[PDB]
Every structure is written in C-alpha cells, then in structure tokens.
Design a protein around this ligand. Structure first.
Ligand SMILES: O=C(O)CNC(=O)C(=O)O
Ligand SMILES: [Fe+2]
Ligand SMILES: [Zn+2]
Ligand SMILES: [Zn+2]
Ligand SMILES: [Zn+2]
Length: 416
DNA sequence: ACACACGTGTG
DNA sequence: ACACACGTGTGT
C-alpha cells in the first residue's frame, strides 16, 4: 500500500489490525483514544526487528531484556515497531498490547485456585510441538509426569481432516472434556472459561477494534464454534498453560488478521507490585531487541528505564539442565548437560525482548505472525504453578454452523 | 519439496 | 485397551 518499496522480511511481518500510524506520536493518539486516558497511563516501547532469534545452547527460550511494569500509574503497555525505511501512513505498527489491570484481582485469585485444582485432578494434557525444543530432547517442562508443566486446550479447534472444526462428527461435542465422565466438573470448568471469555471480549473490542471486528464477522454463522455468553464473541478456543514452556513458535492454525489474548494468573508469592518472586515466567519475542530511545526519542529517558528496572538488561547465564536420552517421538533415561547463553548475549542483534505479565493482566499479540515464546520455570509444578496463562484465539476456517457438520455429511455424500 | 501438527468417532 | 479413516498449510 506504500511506495517506500517491495516489502520483505527484513522489516518484520507487516500487519495493522492491532494499530498503525505514521509515527510513534500517532500511536499514542490512537491508544489514548481507545483506552480513555492521556499521559503517564500509557507506555510505548519501540522494539527493533532483527530476524536473529535468541535461544539457549539447547535451543530453548531465553530473554535478553525484560519490559516490566514501571509503576502502578502505568496502565497500558504498547510495543511498536517502526518499519525500517518506511515514511508512509503505516510506518509504525503495534505488535503487542498489555493491559496491566485486565481482570478483577478477586477473579484472578479465584481462577488461579479453581483452574489449578480442576486441571491437575481432571485435566487431559494436550501435546503440542512447542512443548519441546527442535531436537526434541530437552526437559523444560520437567520430568516428573505428575508435576511437569502442561497445556490443556478447550473449545473448538481446526482440523486438517475436515479443514474445519474438529467437532464436525460429534453429536453434542464436549468443549471442556476432562478425564472420565464427570459432567458437573466439566460444567464448572466451562462456566469459569465462558465467564472469562465474556469478560474479555469488550476489552478486546476496546483496545484492538480492527482485530476484534475481524473475529466476530461470522459470529451468527458459526455460533457453536464460538465461546462467550453475550453478543460479540471473538473467541473459539482457549488453552490453559500451567508452568508450560512454549518454545519459539507461531500459532499457525490461528485465523488470519486476528490476535490472541493471554490472561495471566500467578502463584501467590508474586502478586504485589514491588515483589521478589522466587521465580517467574516471561513472555518473549525472540526476533526483537530494544531501542536506544524511549517512546519520545530520548536516549537518557531509555537509560533511566534501564537503571530503574522498568527495562531490565539481563546478562548471560550458564546453568545445568537435563537432556532426554531419546527424543520424544511424533504423532507419526536422562543425562545432565550444560546450557549457556553467552552467544546470544555477545551479538547485540540477537533478539529476546520479554514482557513480565502480572497477575490479572491481559496481553494482546498477533501470535500467527510474530515468533513468540515463554521461558521455562526453575521447578515446574502444574499442581502449584508459578504462572497460568489462558490463551484465547480463533482458528482458521471456523465459520460453518454446527461445527461444520452439514458440510461433512455432504462431503461423505460424494460416494461412488 | 516435505516433515509435522492447541484430534475424534468409528469398529 | 487397540486400529483405522478423514487429509491443510506453513516455514524452511
Ligand atoms: O502464555 C503465553 O504467554 C504464551 N502462550 C503461547 O504462546 C501458546 O501456548 O501458544
Ligand atoms: Fe503461541
Ligand atoms: Zn526446551
Ligand atoms: Zn511505507
Ligand atoms: Zn466447533
């Protein structure tokens, strides 16, 4: 759409549905309008796309810079990318929005408790490729099967076998299936996530209207493939991640021109603004580094944030981890090894920009397009997790009524 | 190209 | 508890 000219990967994935404008100043104007507040309440960080991925010696997620909530006065964090070379009307795009005070703290406290107890006792683990490094030998979730970090997926999901909702053949699908057949437990679980899906829809509409609008386009066509209890239902699936290390990946089944909302819950020792948690999980963009200047282009302003901790400049580590003796085999013992990261820290252009999302916060990013990851916990324990994330998304080709049951019957009706 | 996947209902 | 049928996109 611009004659800056064409457009490549050197500048990063291009999209505007989280927001775009000719300069950082214009982004503040958009965000102040959406959020209803001007000034210190909104924080914008410029991040530079380098295309060079930060990872450990074993190929597992690491951070290099941590963007942390600067003060209780900061309500909304915005990460932006100024696209290299562009002077057009979409020169600066929004790649992540973080609402610090996303849901009520009393609900976050209760969801932390309810989801942990329900899922550890009744949850069916969902196997995902991003649970493992590329060599598939790492142990970032932990090795105790009773306690290891894990991911549980609910709602509707896309299926290559139907090119549509996996529930195409299910009379009365179970969107929140738990081990056994305890309907009362599944209904409680369902009610919590349906309620939360209902609470977050308006927050999504408010802060990322274009993305939100794309996700409700076929709401009245495929309502069986949407969550939520009130008009305006952008979400289709929800995944709960309990101390789960999501290795660098993109959410490739996600619908184009959408986004994912991540609601973070944290263990009880990490719920005060100025607190030293024994551990914490971070959300990382491994292809980005931080700028030398703040939102307004001041070097000293950026240096003040570095020494204040609002941007935590991390340093290299050398730790001992476990490596599986055999890789985990695909759908189709252990030994100790050193894991380093000096190499990611020696190159200033190897990326690793992390945010530290708080209890009850809401994170919005286009996970289909941006490589993203979560850091492994020191002692993962899904029975008492350091962090729970609830990832709300809509997969592609989820626009048929009744989970696509009509097209499937019509499909098999092409018979001989 | 081509290995791989936030699966489920049949029998 | 198993086997089998159904078959898409992407990043590289
Ligand atoms: O929990 C987070 O912050 C990110 N989670 C994911 O990217 C995922 O499970 O696909
Ligand atoms: Fe993801
Ligand atoms: Zn790993
Ligand atoms: Zn341009
Ligand atoms: Zn469905």
């Amino acid at each position: 759409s611009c004659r800056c000219v064409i457009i490549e990967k050197d500048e990063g994935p291009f999209y505007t549905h989280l927001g775009a404008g000719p300069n950082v100043a214009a982004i503040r104007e958009i965000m102040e309008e959406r959020f209803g507040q001007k000034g210190k309440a909104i924080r914008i960080e410029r991040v530079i796309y380098t295309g060079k991925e930060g990872k450990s010696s074993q190929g597992c997620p690491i951070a290099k810079w941590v963007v942390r909530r600067s003060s209780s006065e900061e309500k909304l964090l915005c990460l932006v990318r100024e696209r290299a070379g562009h002077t057009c009307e979409a020169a600066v795009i929004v790649i992540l929005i973080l609402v610090w005070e996303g849901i009520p703290l009393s609900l976050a406290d209760k969801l932390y408790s309810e989801l942990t107890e329900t899922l550890r006792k009744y949850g069916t683990l969902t196997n995902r490729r991003c649970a493992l490094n590329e060599e598939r030998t790492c142990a970032c979730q932990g090795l105790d099967p009773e306690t290891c970090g894990a991911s549980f997926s609910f709602g509707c999901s896309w299926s290559m076998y139907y090119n549509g909702c996996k529930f195409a053949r299910s009379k009365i699908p179970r969107k929140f299936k738990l081990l056994g057949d305890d309907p009362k437990e599944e209904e409680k679980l369902e009610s919590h996530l349906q309620n939360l899906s209902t609470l977050m829809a308006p927050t999504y509409k408010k802060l990322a209207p274009d993305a939100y609008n794309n996700q409700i386009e076929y709401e009245h066509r495929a309502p069986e493939c949407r969550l939520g209890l009130k008009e305006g239902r952008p979400f289709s699936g929800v995944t709960a991640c309990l101390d789960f290390c999501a290795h660098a990946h993109r959410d490739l089944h996600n619908m184009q021109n959408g986004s994912t909302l991540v609601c973070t819950l944290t263990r009880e020792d990490n719920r005060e603004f100025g607190g030293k948690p024994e551990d914490e999980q971070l959300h990382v963009l491994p292809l980005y580094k931080v700028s030398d200047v703040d939102e307004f282009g001041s070097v000293e302003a950026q240096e003040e944030k570095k020494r204040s901790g609002a941007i935590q400049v991390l340093s290299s580590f050398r730790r001992k981890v476990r490596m599986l003796a055999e890789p985990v085999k695909t759908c189709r013992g252990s030994d100790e090894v050193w894991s380093d990261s000096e190499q990611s820290f020696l190159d200033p252009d190897i990326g690793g920009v992390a945010v530290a999302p708080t209890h009850g916060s809401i994170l919005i990013e286009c996970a289909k397009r941006e490589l993203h990851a979560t850091t492994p916990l020191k002692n993962p324990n899904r029975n008492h997790p350091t962090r729970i994330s609830l990832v709300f998304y809509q997969h592609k080709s989820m626009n048929e009524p009744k989970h696509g049951l009509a097209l499937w019957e019509a499909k098999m009706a092409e018979k001989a």
